PDB file of N, CA and C in Angstrom:
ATOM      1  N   UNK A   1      92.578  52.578  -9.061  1.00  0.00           N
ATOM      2  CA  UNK A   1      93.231  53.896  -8.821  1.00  0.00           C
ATOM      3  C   UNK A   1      92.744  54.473  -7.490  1.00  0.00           C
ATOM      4  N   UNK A   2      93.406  53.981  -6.282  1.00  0.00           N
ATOM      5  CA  UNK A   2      92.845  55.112  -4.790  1.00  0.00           C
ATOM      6  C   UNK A   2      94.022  55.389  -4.609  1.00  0.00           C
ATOM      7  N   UNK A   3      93.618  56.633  -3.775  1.00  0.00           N
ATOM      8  CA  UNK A   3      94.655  57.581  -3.018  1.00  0.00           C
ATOM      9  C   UNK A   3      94.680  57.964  -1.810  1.00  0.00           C
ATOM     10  N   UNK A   4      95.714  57.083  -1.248  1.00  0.00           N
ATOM     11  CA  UNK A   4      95.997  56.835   0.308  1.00  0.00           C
ATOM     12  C   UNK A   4      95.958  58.154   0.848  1.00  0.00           C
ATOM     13  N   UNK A   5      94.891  58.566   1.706  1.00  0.00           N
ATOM     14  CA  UNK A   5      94.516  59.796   2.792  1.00  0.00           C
ATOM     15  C   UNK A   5      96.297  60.202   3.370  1.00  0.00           C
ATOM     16  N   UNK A   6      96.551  59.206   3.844  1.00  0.00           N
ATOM     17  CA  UNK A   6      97.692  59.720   3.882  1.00  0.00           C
ATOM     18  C   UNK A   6      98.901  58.275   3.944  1.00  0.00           C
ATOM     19  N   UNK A   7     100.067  58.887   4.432  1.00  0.00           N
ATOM     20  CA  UNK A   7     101.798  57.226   4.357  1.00  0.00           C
ATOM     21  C   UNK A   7     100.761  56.640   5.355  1.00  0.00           C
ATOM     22  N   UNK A   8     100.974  55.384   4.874  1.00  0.00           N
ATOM     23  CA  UNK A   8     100.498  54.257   5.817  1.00  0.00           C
ATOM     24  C   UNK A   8     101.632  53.249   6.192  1.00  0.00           C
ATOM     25  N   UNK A   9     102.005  53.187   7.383  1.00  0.00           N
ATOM     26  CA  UNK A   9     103.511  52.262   8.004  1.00  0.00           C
ATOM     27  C   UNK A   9     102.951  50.944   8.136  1.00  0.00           C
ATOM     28  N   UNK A  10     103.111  50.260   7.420  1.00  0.00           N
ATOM     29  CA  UNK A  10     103.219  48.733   7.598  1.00  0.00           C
ATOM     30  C   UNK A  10     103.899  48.208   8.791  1.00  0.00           C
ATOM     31  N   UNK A  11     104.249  46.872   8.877  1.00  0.00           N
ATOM     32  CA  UNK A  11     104.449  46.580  10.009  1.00  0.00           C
ATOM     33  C   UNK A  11     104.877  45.194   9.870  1.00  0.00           C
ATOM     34  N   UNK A  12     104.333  44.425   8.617  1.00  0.00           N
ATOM     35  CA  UNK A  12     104.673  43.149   8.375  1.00  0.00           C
ATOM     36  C   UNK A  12     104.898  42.918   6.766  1.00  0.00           C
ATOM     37  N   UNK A  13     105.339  41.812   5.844  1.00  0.00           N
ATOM     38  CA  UNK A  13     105.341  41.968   4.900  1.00  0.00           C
ATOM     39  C   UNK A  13     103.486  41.256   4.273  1.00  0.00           C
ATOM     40  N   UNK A  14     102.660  41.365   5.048  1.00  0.00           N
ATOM     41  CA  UNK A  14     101.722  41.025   4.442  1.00  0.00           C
ATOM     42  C   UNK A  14     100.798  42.378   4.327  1.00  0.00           C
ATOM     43  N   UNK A  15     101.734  43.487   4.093  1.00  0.00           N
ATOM     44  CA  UNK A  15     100.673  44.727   4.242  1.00  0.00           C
ATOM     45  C   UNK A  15     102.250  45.886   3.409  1.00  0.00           C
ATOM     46  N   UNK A  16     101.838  46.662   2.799  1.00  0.00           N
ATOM     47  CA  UNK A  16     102.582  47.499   2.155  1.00  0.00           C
ATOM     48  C   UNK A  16     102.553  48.917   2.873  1.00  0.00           C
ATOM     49  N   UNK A  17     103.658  49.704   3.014  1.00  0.00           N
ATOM     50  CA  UNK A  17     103.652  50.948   3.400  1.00  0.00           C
ATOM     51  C   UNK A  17     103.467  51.960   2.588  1.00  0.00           C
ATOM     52  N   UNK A  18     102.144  52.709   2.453  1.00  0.00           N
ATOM     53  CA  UNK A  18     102.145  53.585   1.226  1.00  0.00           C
ATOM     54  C   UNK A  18     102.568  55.163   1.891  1.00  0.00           C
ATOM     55  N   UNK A  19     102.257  56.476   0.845  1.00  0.00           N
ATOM     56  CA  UNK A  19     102.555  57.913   1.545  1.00  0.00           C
ATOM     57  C   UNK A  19     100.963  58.482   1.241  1.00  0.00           C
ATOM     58  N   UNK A  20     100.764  59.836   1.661  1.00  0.00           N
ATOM     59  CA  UNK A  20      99.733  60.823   1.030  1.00  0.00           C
ATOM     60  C   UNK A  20      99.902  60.911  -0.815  1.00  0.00           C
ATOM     61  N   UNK A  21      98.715  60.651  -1.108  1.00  0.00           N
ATOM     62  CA  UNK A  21      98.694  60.667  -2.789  1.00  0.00           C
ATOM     63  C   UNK A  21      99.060  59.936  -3.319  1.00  0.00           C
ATOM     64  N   UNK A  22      99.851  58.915  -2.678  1.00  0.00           N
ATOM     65  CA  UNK A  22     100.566  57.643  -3.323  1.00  0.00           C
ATOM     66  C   UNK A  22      99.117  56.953  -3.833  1.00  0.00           C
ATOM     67  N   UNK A  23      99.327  56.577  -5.511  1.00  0.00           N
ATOM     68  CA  UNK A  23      98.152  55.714  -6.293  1.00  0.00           C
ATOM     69  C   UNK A  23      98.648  54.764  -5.624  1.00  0.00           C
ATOM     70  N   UNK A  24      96.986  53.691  -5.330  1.00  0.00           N
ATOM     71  CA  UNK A  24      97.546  52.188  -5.324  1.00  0.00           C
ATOM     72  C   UNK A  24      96.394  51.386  -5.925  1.00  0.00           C
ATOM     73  N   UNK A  25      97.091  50.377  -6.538  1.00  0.00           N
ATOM     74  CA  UNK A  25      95.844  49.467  -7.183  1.00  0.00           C
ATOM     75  C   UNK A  25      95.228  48.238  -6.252  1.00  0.00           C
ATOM     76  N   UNK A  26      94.394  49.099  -6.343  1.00  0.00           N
ATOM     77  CA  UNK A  26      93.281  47.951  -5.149  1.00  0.00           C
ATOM     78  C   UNK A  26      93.011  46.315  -5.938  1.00  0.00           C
ATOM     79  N   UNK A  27      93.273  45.744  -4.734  1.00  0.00           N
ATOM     80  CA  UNK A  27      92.923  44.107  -5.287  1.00  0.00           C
ATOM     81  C   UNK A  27      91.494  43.267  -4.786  1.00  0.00           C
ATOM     82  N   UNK A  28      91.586  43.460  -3.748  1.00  0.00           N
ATOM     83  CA  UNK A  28      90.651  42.297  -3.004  1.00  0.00           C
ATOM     84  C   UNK A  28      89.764  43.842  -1.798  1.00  0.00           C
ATOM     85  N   UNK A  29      88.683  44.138  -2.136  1.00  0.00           N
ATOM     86  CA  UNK A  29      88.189  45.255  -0.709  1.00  0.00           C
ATOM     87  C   UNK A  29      86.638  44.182   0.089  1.00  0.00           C
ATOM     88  N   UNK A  30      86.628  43.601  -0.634  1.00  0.00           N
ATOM     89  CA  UNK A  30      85.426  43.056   0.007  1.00  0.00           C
ATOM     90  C   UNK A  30      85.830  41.737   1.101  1.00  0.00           C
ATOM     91  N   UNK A  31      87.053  41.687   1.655  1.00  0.00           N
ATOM     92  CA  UNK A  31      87.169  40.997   2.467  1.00  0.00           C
ATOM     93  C   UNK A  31      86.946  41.549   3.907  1.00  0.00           C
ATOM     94  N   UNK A  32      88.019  42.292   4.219  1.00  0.00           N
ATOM     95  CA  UNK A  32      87.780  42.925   5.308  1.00  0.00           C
ATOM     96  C   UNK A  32      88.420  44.062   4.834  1.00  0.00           C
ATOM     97  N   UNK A  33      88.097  45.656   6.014  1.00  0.00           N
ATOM     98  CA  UNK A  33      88.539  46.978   5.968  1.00  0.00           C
ATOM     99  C   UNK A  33      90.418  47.207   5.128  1.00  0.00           C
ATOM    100  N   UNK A  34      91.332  46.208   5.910  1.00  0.00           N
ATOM    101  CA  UNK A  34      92.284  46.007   4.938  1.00  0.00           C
ATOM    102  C   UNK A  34      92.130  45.115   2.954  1.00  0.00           C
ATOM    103  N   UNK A  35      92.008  46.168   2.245  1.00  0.00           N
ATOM    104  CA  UNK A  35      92.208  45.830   0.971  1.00  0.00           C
ATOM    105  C   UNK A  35      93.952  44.982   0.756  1.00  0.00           C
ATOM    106  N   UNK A  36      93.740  44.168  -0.277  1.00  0.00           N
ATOM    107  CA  UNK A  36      94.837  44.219  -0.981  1.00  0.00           C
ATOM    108  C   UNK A  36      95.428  45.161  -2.314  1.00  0.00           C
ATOM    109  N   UNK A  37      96.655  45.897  -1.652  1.00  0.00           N
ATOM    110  CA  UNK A  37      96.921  46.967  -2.767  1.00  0.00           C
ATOM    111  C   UNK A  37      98.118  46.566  -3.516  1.00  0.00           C
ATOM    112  N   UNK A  38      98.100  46.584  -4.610  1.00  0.00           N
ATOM    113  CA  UNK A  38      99.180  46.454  -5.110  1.00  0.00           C
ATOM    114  C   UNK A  38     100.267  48.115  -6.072  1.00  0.00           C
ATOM    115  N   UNK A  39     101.391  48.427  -5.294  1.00  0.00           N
ATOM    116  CA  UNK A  39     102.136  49.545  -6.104  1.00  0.00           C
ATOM    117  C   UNK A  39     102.917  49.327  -7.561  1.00  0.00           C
ATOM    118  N   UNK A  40     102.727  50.013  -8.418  1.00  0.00           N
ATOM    119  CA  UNK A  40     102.463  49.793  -9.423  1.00  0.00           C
ATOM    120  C   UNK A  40     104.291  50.368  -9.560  1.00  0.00           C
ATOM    121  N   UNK A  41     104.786  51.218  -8.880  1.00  0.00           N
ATOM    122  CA  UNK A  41     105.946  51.917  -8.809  1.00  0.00           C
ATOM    123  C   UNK A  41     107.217  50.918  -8.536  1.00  0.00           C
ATOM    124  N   UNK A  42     107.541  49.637  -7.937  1.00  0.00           N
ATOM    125  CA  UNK A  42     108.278  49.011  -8.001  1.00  0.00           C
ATOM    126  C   UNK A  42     107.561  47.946  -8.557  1.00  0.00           C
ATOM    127  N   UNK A  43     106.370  47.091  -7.837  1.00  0.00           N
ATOM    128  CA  UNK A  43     105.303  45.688  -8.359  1.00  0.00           C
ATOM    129  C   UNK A  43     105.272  45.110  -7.133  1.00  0.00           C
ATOM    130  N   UNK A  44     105.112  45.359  -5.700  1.00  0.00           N
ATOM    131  CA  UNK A  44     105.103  44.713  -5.018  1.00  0.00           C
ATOM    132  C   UNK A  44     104.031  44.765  -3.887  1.00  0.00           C
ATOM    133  N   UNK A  45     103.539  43.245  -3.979  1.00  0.00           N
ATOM    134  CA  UNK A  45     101.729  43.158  -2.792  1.00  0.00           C
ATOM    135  C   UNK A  45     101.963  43.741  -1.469  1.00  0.00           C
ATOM    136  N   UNK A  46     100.500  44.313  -1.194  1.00  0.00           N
ATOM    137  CA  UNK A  46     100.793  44.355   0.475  1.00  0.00           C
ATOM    138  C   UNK A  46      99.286  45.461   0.632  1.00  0.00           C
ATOM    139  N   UNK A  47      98.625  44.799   1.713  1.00  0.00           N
ATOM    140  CA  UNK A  47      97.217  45.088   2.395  1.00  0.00           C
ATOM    141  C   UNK A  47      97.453  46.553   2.303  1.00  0.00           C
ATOM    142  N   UNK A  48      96.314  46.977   2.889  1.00  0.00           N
ATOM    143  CA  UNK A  48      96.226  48.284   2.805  1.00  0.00           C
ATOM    144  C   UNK A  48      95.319  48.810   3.695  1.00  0.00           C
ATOM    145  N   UNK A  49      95.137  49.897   4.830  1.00  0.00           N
ATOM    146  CA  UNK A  49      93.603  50.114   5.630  1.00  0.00           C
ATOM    147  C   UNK A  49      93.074  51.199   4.787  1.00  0.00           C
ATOM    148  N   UNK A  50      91.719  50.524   4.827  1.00  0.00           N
ATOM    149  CA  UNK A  50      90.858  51.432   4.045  1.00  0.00           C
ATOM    150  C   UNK A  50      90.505  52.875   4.505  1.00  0.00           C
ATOM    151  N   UNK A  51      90.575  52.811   5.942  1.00  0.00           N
ATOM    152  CA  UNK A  51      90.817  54.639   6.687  1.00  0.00           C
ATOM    153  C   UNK A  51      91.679  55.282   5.850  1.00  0.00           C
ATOM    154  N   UNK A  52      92.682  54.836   5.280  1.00  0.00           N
ATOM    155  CA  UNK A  52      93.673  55.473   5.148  1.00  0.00           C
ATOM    156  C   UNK A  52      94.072  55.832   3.656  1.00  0.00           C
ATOM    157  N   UNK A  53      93.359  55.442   2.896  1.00  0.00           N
ATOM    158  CA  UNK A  53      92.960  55.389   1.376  1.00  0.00           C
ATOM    159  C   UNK A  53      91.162  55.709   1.145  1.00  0.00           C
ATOM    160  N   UNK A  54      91.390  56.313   0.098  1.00  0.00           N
ATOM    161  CA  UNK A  54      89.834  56.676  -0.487  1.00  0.00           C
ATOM    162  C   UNK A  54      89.560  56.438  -2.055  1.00  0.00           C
ATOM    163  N   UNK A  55      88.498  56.465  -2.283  1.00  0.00           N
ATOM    164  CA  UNK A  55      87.955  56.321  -3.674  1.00  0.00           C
ATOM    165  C   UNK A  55      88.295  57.443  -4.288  1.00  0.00           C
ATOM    166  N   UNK A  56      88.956  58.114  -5.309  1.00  0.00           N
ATOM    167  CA  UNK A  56      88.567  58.932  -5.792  1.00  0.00           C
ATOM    168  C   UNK A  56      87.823  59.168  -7.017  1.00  0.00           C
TER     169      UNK A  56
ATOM    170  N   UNK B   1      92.577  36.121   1.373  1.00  0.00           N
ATOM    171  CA  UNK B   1      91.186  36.191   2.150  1.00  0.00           C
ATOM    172  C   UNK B   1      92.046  36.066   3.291  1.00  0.00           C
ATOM    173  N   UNK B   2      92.460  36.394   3.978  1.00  0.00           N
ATOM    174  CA  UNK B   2      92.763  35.917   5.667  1.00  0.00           C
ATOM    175  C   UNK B   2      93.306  37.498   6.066  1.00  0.00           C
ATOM    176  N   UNK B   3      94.875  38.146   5.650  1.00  0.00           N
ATOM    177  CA  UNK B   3      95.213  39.228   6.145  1.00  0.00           C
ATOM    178  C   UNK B   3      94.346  40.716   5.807  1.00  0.00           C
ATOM    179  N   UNK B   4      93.196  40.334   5.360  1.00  0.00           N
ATOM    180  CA  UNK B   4      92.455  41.593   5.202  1.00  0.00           C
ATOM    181  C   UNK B   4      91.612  42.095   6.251  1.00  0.00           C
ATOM    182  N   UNK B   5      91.798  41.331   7.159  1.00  0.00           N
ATOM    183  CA  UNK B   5      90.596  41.541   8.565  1.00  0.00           C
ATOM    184  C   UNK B   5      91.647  41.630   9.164  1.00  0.00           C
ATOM    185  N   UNK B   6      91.465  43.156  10.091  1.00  0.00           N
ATOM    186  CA  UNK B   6      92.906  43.813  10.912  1.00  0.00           C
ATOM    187  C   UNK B   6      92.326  45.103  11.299  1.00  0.00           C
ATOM    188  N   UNK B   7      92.746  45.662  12.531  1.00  0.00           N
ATOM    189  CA  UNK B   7      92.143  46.601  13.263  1.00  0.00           C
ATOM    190  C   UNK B   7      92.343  47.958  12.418  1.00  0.00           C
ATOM    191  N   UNK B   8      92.119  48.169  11.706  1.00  0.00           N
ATOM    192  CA  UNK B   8      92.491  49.428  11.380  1.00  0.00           C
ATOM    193  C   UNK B   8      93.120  50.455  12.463  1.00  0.00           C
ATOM    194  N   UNK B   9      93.952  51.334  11.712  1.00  0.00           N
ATOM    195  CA  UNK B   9      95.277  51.990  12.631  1.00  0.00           C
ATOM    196  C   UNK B   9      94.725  53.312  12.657  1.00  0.00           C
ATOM    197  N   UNK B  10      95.249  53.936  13.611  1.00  0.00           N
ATOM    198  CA  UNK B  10      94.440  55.372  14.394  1.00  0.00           C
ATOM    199  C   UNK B  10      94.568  56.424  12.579  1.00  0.00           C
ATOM    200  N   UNK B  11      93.384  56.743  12.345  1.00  0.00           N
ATOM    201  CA  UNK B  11      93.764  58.034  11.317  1.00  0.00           C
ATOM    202  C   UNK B  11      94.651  59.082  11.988  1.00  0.00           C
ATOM    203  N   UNK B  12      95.364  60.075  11.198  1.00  0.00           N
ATOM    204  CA  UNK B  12      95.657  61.436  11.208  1.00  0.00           C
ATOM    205  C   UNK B  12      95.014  62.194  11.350  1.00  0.00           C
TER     206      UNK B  12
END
């Protein structure tokens, strides 16, 4: 359960575009600063920058 | 393991 600081614009399909408050389910954070997030709102993968999402 | 290392994008 994190909540993206604020919309994050993707750019490729190996990274998802989220908004402000948008939940996303974190997959993979211990790789690098991009997590894998997955949205639970349609089901579909895509990285995520960790600036741009927080723990809550 | 590969697309998770990426420059992170300017905050707001």
């Amino acid at each position: 359960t994190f909540v993206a600081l604020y919309d994050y614009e993707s750019r490729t399909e190996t990274d998802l575009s989220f908004k402000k408050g948008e939940r996303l389910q974190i997959v993979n954070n211990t790789e690098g600063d991009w997590w894998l997030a997955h949205s639970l709102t349609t089901g579909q993968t895509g990285y995520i920058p960790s600036n741009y999402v927080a723990p809550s | 393991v590969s697309l998770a290392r990426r420059p992170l994008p300017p905050l707001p």
